Nucleic acid binder design. Structure first.
Ligand code: MG
Ligand code: MG
Ligand code: ZN
Lengths: 175, 163, 52, 204, 198, 190
RNA sequence: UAGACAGCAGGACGGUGGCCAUGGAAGUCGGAAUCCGCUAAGGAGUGUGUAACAACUCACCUGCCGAAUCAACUAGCCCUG
């Protein structure tokens, strides 16, 4: 799987009946992916590991997008993970800040490529939780739990360099 | 004894310490105490009757566990026989000096403690029974002019009465 | 031959040290890792041998 | 006479074991596959720590013996002469051929110099059985052993009880209920299907 | 470790301070525990004697249950090296006791010179090894048939100095140390009434 | 990670006055003046109080290493204040077995001549760094003194001597001859 | 925050050579071993030289600064090889 900017989809599914069993159980999952053609496919990936079904022996009843409930309120997210490196297979827990659940997850897949260099086909996502200001075990996020917070914008580089390319004024990097 | 309460062969020789005084914890609550049928009042009454002069002197302890009346002869106080001929009596309530008379004046107790040992801790004609009864000159003493650590290379008596 | 306190002061700078087994170096006596890049901060040390 | 082991590390050729078709091979350098107080009942030595493999390769009889000895020495010096029981869970059944060029490349089919053992991933090579206060010494022992093998191995504790196949949390209850019997260095499970005379003998 | 040792002290020292009213605290100067060790032969558990740690900074938990006054009035008095010596007994008697209940008092150097120094008109010890120790200071060293007998009566040391290596090795090695004191009386716990030891 | 702020502070006594042209510190006091530049660290220095009582140094958005510099600036300043207010004095002693050493001072306090080390005929000359003044001592025979206001030049100066006076091609565990530092200290005990 | 963790400052006794080994092992290539207490705690004791020492020293508490720290694993870029 590749990635763009991700989205959350609610997919719920069922096996196929037969003269033995008439109404089998339903099964729900919560999935993050670009669009609905891939999410259906990731669904059969997981549900096959857990239970004993396949695509020919089942049907997709509903697949739909779930929208954020409060997208203008800053939130703290906590993420539980399974990936596999070049040697073994590992678990972990990570924390982030964002407005939307989608954006936090997206923010992970980048981060893992950078620290640990894992491609998306090597990652499984179990659970995501809106965490309080407490219960945050990681300091990078606790820096920002301050009612009276401030800081400056120190050394600020010139963007827009090739607007004038040959000048006379040497720049200024103090504001 | 294994299958049920069958007292056939239980006479045993165990080891305790903290000194043979009446104490606040009494020094008579070991782990081997509650195996041996000893209530707390009598097991001290025998110990204080047994600890009469010869010897009231604090030794570590020893106890040949019998049923009721348990004798405890003087153990192998060998660092403490440096001092256990202290001018008696000194039991309790009059002990302002820890062990500080400095009046052992080694003249006879060296060889008398040497023979008093029951051929214990030695493969020698009492040479080790001198050595390990001299291993503890920390707070010891000697003749009024003699000091430890600069007399320990001389012997001036006869080894005929050793065992 | 020499006053003991001065003698101690000399031995400070010429006898009380640790030695990497690889790079054959000198280190302060309270060390656990070498200082050189030739060995890789190697964590394998001994003390210096005092005269008999 | 012996070569390095980079020449024979990978599982290239098919198995060619010792049988009526292959004759003329020596024996192996290892002959003993377990040590320690190998008689202890199931209750004395409940803890098990394993060595596990992570490659598909070949291991030699020499390697196994060297590893066997290094572990025994330290384990003695740490705990005791009878504080443990150790077992090796591999056997050298596959054979190695050598073509000696003292013709050239004509008539090439070797001579059976050697024996070696094959490994799959997840298999077990070594295992130790002892008590719980001696956990870290067990780990230290095996760690000294990995430096005798060509590969990447790793160590883990088992949830089981000893060299059995039952979970520790269940075992202890399950022996006080007459499903498991301690018949030696192992156990013996028994179900509710046989003839009752064995239920009469028990429960009495 | 520190598991069962302090699991006692979750409530043990709390219990000591609640149920049994009056006490003393003994300050420990730069001292070896010989005094705290062989104080056994000064007294017994008439009440108890036990120096511990600085748990006497943990007093909000102690006044939590409203046990006894005069408890919280010690936090400045404990910045390091102090203990606690418990007696529910006659006041002025134990005052006089721990004024000078400090016998062993061994330390090579570091302490004070409390009183005036006098003529050493005694035989502390003779050494034929070397006489430079006396020749350096330059006092009468009349030799009368090997031995050395001094008769000069003059003043050498006076109160308010700082001890040096010379007299430090002197007072260790020659079996004389009028130099160290062990553990002194300084406070009063009258169950709530705070006054001085006059 | 990165962190938003780290800061640390230094006080000043009344006797002393300091000033700053950005990252260029000016100290003055009884024993003169000192001048030192910190234009290679990227910090913000500020000075606040009645007649500039107290100094703080702070940094924004730095790594593990870049935070490590903040206390190091402060440590230098404490040293400069102490030097201009008190001044540094290091004492050095000589050691020998058979052949003693003869040290003399040619200029007022600049040039040193070491002579007869291990019975050689060669002569060793040393030049003090500027500002430092050396002079033989009293009440102990074999002893030097180095006074200065800048610890750097002193310590640099004393160590030139210690390395110039050293032995080669032998076992040094026995041959222990040289000039070795005795103790650091101050011109004034206050 | 009951003040640990780094550093400065009082140490490592008795039944006890436990006990093999004595050619040497009162800790002393070192091996089955490894109870008891004195305190507030000294381990049937950690390398050192060793007829053997006494002891040097490698857990244990009396104070200074002082706290959010400590240990063992594991994997990514860089480094030695
Ligand atoms: Mg082939
Ligand atoms: Mg040998
Ligand atoms: Zn190195």
């Amino acid at each position: 799987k590749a990635s763009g900017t991700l989205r959350e989809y609610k997919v719920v599914g069922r096996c196929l009946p037969t003269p033995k069993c008439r109404t089998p159980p339903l099964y729900r999952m919560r999935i993050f992916a670009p669009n609905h053609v891939v999410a259906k496919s990731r669904f059969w990936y997981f549900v096959s590991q857990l239970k004993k079904m396949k695509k020919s022996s089942g049907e997709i009843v509903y697949c739909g997008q779930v929208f954020e409930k409060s997208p203008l309120r800053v939130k703290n997210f906590g993420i539980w993970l399974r990936y596999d490196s070049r040697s073994g297979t590992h678990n972990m827990y990570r924390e982030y800040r964002d407005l939307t659940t989608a954006g936090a997850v997206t923010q992970c897949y980048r981060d893992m490529g950078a620290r640990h260099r894992a491609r998306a086909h090597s990652i499984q996502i179990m659970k995501v939780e809106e965490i309080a200001a407490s219960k945050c075990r990681r300091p990078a996020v606790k820096q920002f739990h301050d009612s009276k917070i401030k800081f400056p914008l120190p050394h600020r580089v010139l963007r827009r360099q090739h607007k004038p390319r040959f000048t006379t004024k040497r720049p200024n990097t103090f504001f | 004894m294994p299958p049920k309460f069958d007292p056939n062969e239980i006479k045993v020789v165990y080891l305790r310490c903290t000194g043979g005084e009446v104490g606040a914890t009494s020094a008579l609550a070991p782990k081997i105490g509650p195996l041996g049928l000893s209530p707390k009042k009598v097991g001290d009454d025998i110990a204080k009757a047994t600890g009469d002069w010869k010897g009231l002197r604090i030794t570590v302890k020893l106890t040949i566990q019998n049923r009721q009346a348990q004798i405890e002869v003087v153990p192998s106080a060998s660092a403490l026989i440096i001092k256990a001929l202290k001018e008696p009596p000194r039991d309790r309530k009059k002990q302002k000096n820890i062990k500080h008379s400095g009046n052992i004046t080694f003249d006879e107790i060296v060889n008398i403690a040497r023979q008093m040992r029951h051929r214990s801790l030695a493969r020698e004609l009492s040479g080790t029974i001198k050595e390990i009864l001299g291993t503890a000159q920390s707070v010891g003493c000697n003749v009024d002019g003699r000091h430890p650590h600069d007399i320990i290379d001389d012997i001036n008596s006869g080894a005929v009465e050793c065992p | 031959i020499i006053e003991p306190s001065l003698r101690q002061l000399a031995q400070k700078y010429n006898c009380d040290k640790m030695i990497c087994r690889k790079c054959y170096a000198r280190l302060h006596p309270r060390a656990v890792n070498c200082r050189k890049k030739k060995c890789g901060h190697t964590n394998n040390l001994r003390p210096k041998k005092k005269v008999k | 006479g012996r070569r390095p082991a980079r020449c024979y590390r990978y599982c290239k050729n098919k198995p060619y074991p010792k049988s009526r078709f292959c004759r003329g091979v020596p024996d192996a350098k290892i002959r003993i596959f377990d040590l320690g107080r190998k008689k202890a009942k199931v209750d004395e030595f409940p803890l098990c720590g394993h060595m596990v493999s992570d490659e598909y390769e070949q291991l030699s009889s020499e390697a196994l013996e060297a590893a066997r000895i290094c572990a025994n020495k330290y384990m003695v010096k740490s705990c005791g002469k009878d504080g443990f029981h150790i077992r090796v869970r591999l056997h050298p059944f596959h054979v190695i051929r050598i073509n000696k060029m003292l013709t050239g490349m004509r008539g090439a089919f070797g001579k059976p110099q050697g024996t070696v053992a094959r490994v799959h991933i997840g298999q077990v090579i070594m295992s130790i059985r002892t008590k719980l206060q001696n956990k870290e010494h067990v780990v230290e022992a095996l760690r000294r052993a990995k430096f005798k093998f060509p590969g990447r191995q790793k160590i883990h504790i088992s949830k089981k009880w000893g060299f059995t196949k039952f979970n520790a949390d269940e075992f202890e209850d399950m022996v006080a209920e007459k499903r498991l019997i301690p018949d030696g260095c192992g156990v013996k499970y028994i179900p509710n299907r046989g003839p009752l005379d064995k239920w009469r003998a028990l429960h009495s | 470790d520190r598991a069962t040792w302090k699991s006692n002290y979750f409530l043990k020292i709390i219990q000591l301070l609640d149920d049994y009213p009056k006490c003393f605290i003994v300050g420990a100067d730069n001292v070896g525990s010989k005094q705290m060790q062989q104080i056994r032969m000064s007294l017994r558990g008439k009440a108890v004697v036990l120096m511990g740690k600085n748990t006497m900074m943990r007093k909000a938990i102690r006044g939590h249950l409203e046990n006894n006054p005069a408890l919280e009035k010690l936090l400045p008095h404990i910045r390091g090296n102090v203990g606690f010596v418990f007696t529910k007994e006659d006041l002025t008697e134990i005052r006089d006791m721990l004024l000078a209940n400090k016998v062993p008092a061994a330390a090579r150097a570091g302490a004070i010179a409390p009183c005036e120094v006098t003529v050493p008109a005694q035989n502390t010890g003779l050494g034929p090894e070397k006489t430079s120790f006396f020749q350096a200071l330059g006092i009468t060293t009349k030799i009368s048939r090997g031995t050395i007998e001094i008769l000069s009566d003059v003043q050498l040391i006076k109160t308010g100095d700082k001890v040096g290596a010379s007299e430090a090795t002197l007072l260790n090695m020659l079996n004389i140390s009028p130099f160290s004191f062990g553990l002194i009386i300084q406070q009063v716990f009258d169950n709530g009434s705070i006054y001085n030891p006059e | 990670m990165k962190t938003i702020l780290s800061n640390q502070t230094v006080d000043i006594p009344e006797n002393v006055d300091i000033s700053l042209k950005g990252r260029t510190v000016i100290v003055k006091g009884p024993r003169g003046t000192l001048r030192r530049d910190f234009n290679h660290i990227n910090v913000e220095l500020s000075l606040l109080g009645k007649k500039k009582k107290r100094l703080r140094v702070d940094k924004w958005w730095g790594n593990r290493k870049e935070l490590a510099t903040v206390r190091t600036i402060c440590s230098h300043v404490q040293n400069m204040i102490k030097g201009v207010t008190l001044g540094f004095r290091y004492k050095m002693r000589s050691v020998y077995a058979h052949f003693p050493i003869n040290v003399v001072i040619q200029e007022n306090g600049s040039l040193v001549e070491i002579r007869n080390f291990l019975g050689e005929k060669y002569i060793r000359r040393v030049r003090m760094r500027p500002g430092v003044a050396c002079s033989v001592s009293q009440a102990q025979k074999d002893e030097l003194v180095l006074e200065g206001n800048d610890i750097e030049l002193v310590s640099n100066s004393a160590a030139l001597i210690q390395q110039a006076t050293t032995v080669k091609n032998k076992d040094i565990r026995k041959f222990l001859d040289g000039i070795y530092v005795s103790e650091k200290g101050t011109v004034q005990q206050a």
